[PDB]
Symmetry: D3
Subunit: 152 residues, 6 copies
């Protein structure tokens, strides 16, 4: 019922679970030309690894499970991140790995383009909307915000 | 390590939580010209609503929480579904709504292009890969399949 | 509504990694009774049963690679009559078959299901193992015709 | 490695989610003659409904989500409950319905015969083991109890 | 490794829907003591406190729309010192703030946190409310330098 | 609506996940003088460590994941435990570590003072309420207990 405009130059969040970090570094390397045209941001460890392995400049927030997940989530809700690339691990996710559901649900709340694997990431990155504005329909949350609060 | 080729004409799964079903129907409607080039399959209620509201032909499996989730997951694992559009509800998901994590985890296992909202779906559908072959890198599970089994 | 389990059962056999040897021993101890039925298993569990015991077991994919969903589909299609799922309540691994989603579908369709060997022993000892059994199943017609909200 | 012997006269826990309570009452009624040979115990509301509808004597602990789940779990761990009949709701489980996983995991820990639907309950109740001793194999938890405790 | 809470605290106030009136009554009962500190809340909770009590509270977004993460970010950045989170253990709604994710981050950073009014009363009665408090923070140096698997 | 009175001499549960056990022991050691004025109870492994390392008397129930969690939860619901100190591990919780959610939700049900980290525990222990009676407001569950049970 409402609209969010993604700008022409995107801010792209880059996050990987530990067992997918090398996969994400390889994906960034293969798409370095396209990705470095945009603003890149990452959780602490993923971002340090991209910089150490590739020399690609990426803004870093805290490590995911130490608050980086919430920092990126805050920026999504504040319309400061436009695209999320999150390689999560469906087989060997570790106790400290970023929480998958909580991270993805906020992207759905705000109708943010989001990839959870490299095939989706390839489709997203190849879209012409990478380089234009994109008008994302969002739910009108005004009714939710004005909801009646129970007495008990 | 291993590579899977998505065919030019895709099989696209269509699934929506109850509070997103109308959104998915409108999304299918606005992309009908592009979508009818592909094979469409859906959970029972979602597929029935698409067919009744739009007259668009969709193969229907069982209702999601009655087993349709597992039927579509089986087809994903069997490489019979190439793209998944799953509009799930991040705010008002009902007790009977299809389990989000278990469904999308299997897409990640097999590196399936997958959208959880209409913005991701628009990016996927606008990709040139929508109408050409796409080579998806598949994780190697040979080590996992040959893993040591504990004694107790 | 009513479902009828056939005389000869189709029995799914699934174990978490730390319970696989227990499941193999259970199949070995009950081999005479079990091989009268159709046995099906996730990939690794079925491979282990066939290699360790020489008992014939149809194998689907490994549980976390899709085998869970393949067996779940057969449960929902009433092609599996009995589920034996030894899951690990103490050291379940990141890749172990997800417990809730697998057993919730048995409850949906009122499928006999064991989650440990004591339940499996009680199920296998029932006279219903080798005869037909008529199970009451929940009525889902109202659910299937439910009103769909506008947003 | 270790053995736990169930006595000839069993203690049977009876628990149902709200939308399965009438099903459980009908099941108890159908098996009342067999069940009253044993010791029956139930969560607060379930037991109240059984006594009120059927006149069958059932010991009652607190309501499930108010602590009754933990009271029954304590008795399972203390070998004071031998069989568990838990009709939980796979479709319309309510916010307050007894947490399924936590309850049944303890039954699995101690290898307790347990039914989650009436078909399993019918198979269990028809076992000859209902009326005899039954030797249940349990894991030896001594190694776990003596495990190395990490320094940090 | 020691973090110092200042004398004047920043206190987050959050409640699930069926606990909002309880939190408002609690804030009301302790208004004199609480307004000595910096109060911050999720959107609806803070709106309710201001509308019902006239107590000044900085408001972030609604919890499930991102407010949970905004407060979590501030916790991780040591900008919130005390968290009062009345969550609903019986009738939590589909949109209610994610309990585990919210309180986990307080545990990560050893933040004083209340999940019910009794804990909130104990926290507010502490002499540490109005003095500095030295909080031990877990060492994450080993975690931050952990080896990253090849796949 | 209802009121629960904590007595001046408290019963305090002490529980730690494995990677937090040394932290909890060190915390008990720093507060031993104040704590030994009260009735201390713990899960099996945690309690054994406190007794052996500190010479502090602690009643021990079973190990947490073997039923000790439910034993303490039962006592919480029966108002036999007044304060809960539960150092759980937000980073490296193991498969066998005590279920965090189920344990703390029951403390919230009965409005039990509860600490999940040492800073909260320090605030609780410094409270003037530690050594006096304290009246806790508890939700009235009478309406919940008398709720209508659905027919299907």
């Amino acid at each position: 019922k409402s609209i969010r405009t993604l700008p022409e130059r995107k801010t792209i969040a880059l996050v990987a679970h530990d067992h997918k970090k090398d996969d994400l570094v390889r994906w960034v390397q293969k798409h370095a030309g396209k990705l470095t045209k945009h603003n890149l941001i990452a959780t602490g460890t993923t971002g340090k690894l991209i910089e150490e392995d590739l020399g690609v400049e990426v803004k870093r927030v805290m490590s995911g499970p130490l608050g980086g997940d919430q920092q990126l989530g805050s920026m999504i809700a504040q319309r400061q991140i436009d695209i999320v690339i999150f390689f999560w691990d469906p087989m060997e996710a570790q106790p400290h790995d970023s929480d998958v559901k909580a991270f993805i649900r906020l992207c759905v709340v705000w109708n943010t383009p989001m990839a959870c694997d490299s095939a989706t990431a390839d489709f997203i990155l190849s879209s012409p909307f990478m380089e234009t504005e994109y008008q994302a329909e969002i739910p009108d949350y005004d009714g939710y915000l004005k909801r009646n609060i129970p007495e008990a």
